[PDB]
Symmetry: C4
Subunit: 103 residues, 4 copies
Amino acid sequence: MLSFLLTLKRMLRACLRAWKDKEFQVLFVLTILTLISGTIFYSTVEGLRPIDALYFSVVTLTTVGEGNFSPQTDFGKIFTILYIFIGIGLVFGFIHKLAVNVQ
Amino acid sequence: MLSFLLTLKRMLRACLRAWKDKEFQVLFVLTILTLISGTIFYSTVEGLRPIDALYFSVVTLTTVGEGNFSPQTDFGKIFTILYIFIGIGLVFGFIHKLAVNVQL
Amino acid sequence: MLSFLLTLKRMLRACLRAWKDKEFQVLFVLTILTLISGTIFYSTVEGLRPIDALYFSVVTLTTVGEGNFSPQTDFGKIFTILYIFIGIGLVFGFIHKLAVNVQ
Amino acid sequence: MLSFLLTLKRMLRACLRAWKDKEFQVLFVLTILTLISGTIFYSTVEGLRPIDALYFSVVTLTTVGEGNFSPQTDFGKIFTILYIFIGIGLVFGFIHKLAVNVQL
Ligand SMILES: [Ca+2]
Ligand SMILES: [Ca+2]
Ligand code: NA
Ligand code: NA
Ligand code: NA
């Protein structure tokens, strides 16, 4: 259905149009930064291969959760707790940004 | 209790009246497309039984999370990290939509 | 701080004022119903003690997730998938309800 | 890149300017109160080391979820089911707030 594609593309444009908005860019960078930080921390303190440090940071920052790994060190547990709250702040950031992009 | 049914019925009507929006429809199709790729990917690369690839795909794309399985291959891991953000993109699309339908 | 308590109570009133709204009531009942259904299904098909069937239904319906149990039977896995999507619809229901309660 | 910093700074100002709302403050305090009760409850009833009770409390109240531990006692299980809904109540409160701050 052509109606289908036209709608999809319209949406894809409204999407990319947002990837131009400065505030969206900031939020995006902050989460990429947060992901890098997490990849580093868990790689160092919990000693995971970088790929597994990133993976854990992702499933954790997004509240999906990891089914097997849990922070072993006390430093990791404390960091992860703060890490999670950073993620919540980020999402509220994005959410809020959408509530504004309506008017 | 009659108000319960009349309201419930008025709501179950909106949930369908909204199942008519071309933008919602797209989001939905995209979600099914995503769920199917995940199923294919996880059954192939991680060699999971099909229904378990869909299951993992579902609980992962919805942030519920799987309590026993975690991608074993570095390939699955990368895909999953990407699969998750797609899922977040989709939920934001849905929410953006409500916001729009609401403020209109 | 009295300012503190006054605010808290104001909020608690705006909360209970919602537990009167019919649509909120419907949504509430539906999730209680969904929770009961889940408690029953998992108790039967996955054969868990009712308390563990409820628990799993809760952590699952809310995307928190269970760290040890995963559906064993094919019927359970299919049901859980639908169960999750019901939960997402419910939350969108509540979310949407809040977006309306602003105007 | 200057716009990045000026915007970032304008935003980091709102996140603080909003950290001044009496209703947000309350939500925050309530969250800390909840996190502390959870820590006390889980360390006592499930006999978890304090920092692990807080950790479980945190990942549970935020729906992230814990991958290894699950309450063992029927008491913990009930509390957790309740702890979760409180958490959902809190996140809705926060969101309701944004909605209000936004449409004003
Ligand atoms: Ca989770
Ligand atoms: Ca596990
Ligand atoms: Na989990
Ligand atoms: Na979640
Ligand atoms: Na969530």
